[model samples]
Structure formats: structure tokens, C-alpha cells
Target: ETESMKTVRIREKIKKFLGDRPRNTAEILEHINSTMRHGTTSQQLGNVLSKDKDIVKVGYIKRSGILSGGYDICEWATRNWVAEHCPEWTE
Candidate 1:
């Protein structure tokens, strides 16, 4: 009963962004935080994106293997991923 719609859609947006390709959580965090003035820190972002049953980490990305800190890379392979769209419902 605790799966509030807020966090639900957060996962939705994240899944949408991850469509068609794997992505670094940093980019995902940035994309969401940029438009969302409310802002989601890396820790919180990771919790949602990582916790979602539908979203999964595909790999870990690093810069030339010299410095690594971009964040976990994840992807979604939902058969209906393209059809899975987030509806508009503001609180």
C-alpha cells in the first residue's frame, strides 16, 4: 500500500529515459533533477531506479577505466517498453 504514485511515476520516467539504450545513473539523475526543481539526489535516485522491479542495472560505466564515478549503468528490456508511457497526473 506504500507504493505511492509519486515514486511510481519516478520509476516510469526513469524507465522511459532508459528506453532503447542503457544509461548511466548520473545522466538519469541529471535529466530528472534538471526538470524537477524538487530535485533527487544520487542516493535517492539510485534507490528508486535500482529498487524498481522493471528496471535493472546492465553494467557499470567508467571513464577510460582511469576514473570511475559516473554511476551505475542500467537498462530496461520490457517487451512493452515502448508502450509503457507515463500519464500526466500532477499532485
Candidate 2:
């Protein structure tokens, strides 16, 4: 796929990545695992988007998703991941 296509896919993933949730780390983690294992196109896409960076998982635990402190931190980290790898997307 072209870089533009990849960028579009990543953007979609980011959008879905920020949707409502169960508001619990365990639930989020379960969501992540389920989606990664049996998610829709966008959900799987988010997983791919997530795998593109290590920092995104810096504070993540297998049993928890965004942690209790705040999802903002995790979102910021994911944003950083995309920014680093897809600098063109920033514009």
C-alpha cells in the first residue's frame, strides 16, 4: 500500500482507539486481547498502530490496558508513536 493509504488506515485506527470503553484496565485489556484476537478491521488496525512503537507499551501491563492513572497518558504515548513513525501525518 502507498504511504497515504497507510496513513489513512492509521488515522482511522487512532479515531477508534479513542472511543468509549468500560473504564477499567482489566476490561480494556480484555478488549485489547479480544480485538487483537478477533477484532474488526479497525480494531485490528489499532493493534497494528499500537505495535508500531515501544513507548506505547511502556506502562502497559498484560492484565491491564490504559492503567488507572489516566488514559490520557496512554493516548499521548500512542500519539507519540504515530508522530515518530508517521511525521507526515502531523501536517
Candidate 3:
């Protein structure tokens, strides 16, 4: 199956956003919206990230602020994933 340009664009954007750090969905979505002027639902973002081998969940980050309710959000990274997924990726 072929991937849409939107999907490919989002995937590359996500990787660039990740760089050497991990980011939660909220942060990622916010950055995307601010930089790309496009809105993406949390579920859609999660689906795209989860389905790709080049996007891996690094850990959980606790939500900030008083009303956060102590919930932990998922943090994702692509450094390791890229090393594993890309043939040209080197140490």
C-alpha cells in the first residue's frame, strides 16, 4: 500500500521534531499546529506514530500543572528507531 503525502510529511515532521529528544503527543501536536498550521487529533497522531517502526515510545512523562490529575503521557523518540530502521543510519 502507498502512503499519502500527508502521512509522509507528518512522519518526516515528527522525526525532525523528535531529533535527539522525546516528546509527548500534546507537545508534538502543539508544535505541528504552530509550525505547519494544521490541526491533528490526538488519536490520529497516536495512530500515525504507533504504526511506524521509526517512531518508538521512549517512556511516560507526567502531565504538568495543578489540574493534570497525575496522569502520565507517553513520550516518543526516533534516534534509536532510525538507527534500527534506516540502512544509512550510523553510530
Q: In terms of TM-score, which candidate is strongest? A: 3
Provide TM-scores for the models: 0.61, 0.26, 0.68
Candidate 2: where are CA atoms >4 Å away? Answer: 21-91
The local lDDT score (0 to 100) that residue 55 gets in candidate 3 is 81
Q: Least accurate stretch of 10 residues (summed lDDT) in model 3?
A: 82-91
Model 1 residue 16 lDDT score: 80
The lDDT of each candidate is: 0.63, 0.43, 0.78
Top model by lDDT, which number? 3
- Which digits, one per residue and each the tens of the lDDT, describe model 1 over residues 1-91? 2447667767778778777666677788887877755767888887886667677555564444446535435443332442444334111
**True lDDT of residue 53, candidate 3:** 75
Question: After superposition on all CA atoms, how large is the RMSD of candidate 1?
Answer: 8.7
Kindly list the per-residue Cα lDDT of model 3 for residues 1-91, writing each as its tens digit.
Answer: 2347777888889999898677888898887777665657788888988987788886776666677667657888896755655659554
In terms of TM-score, how similar is model 3 to the real structure? 0.68
Candidate 1 Cα misplacement greater than 4 A, ranges: 1-3, 61-91
List per-candidate RMSD values in Å.
Answer: 8.7, 10.4, 5.8
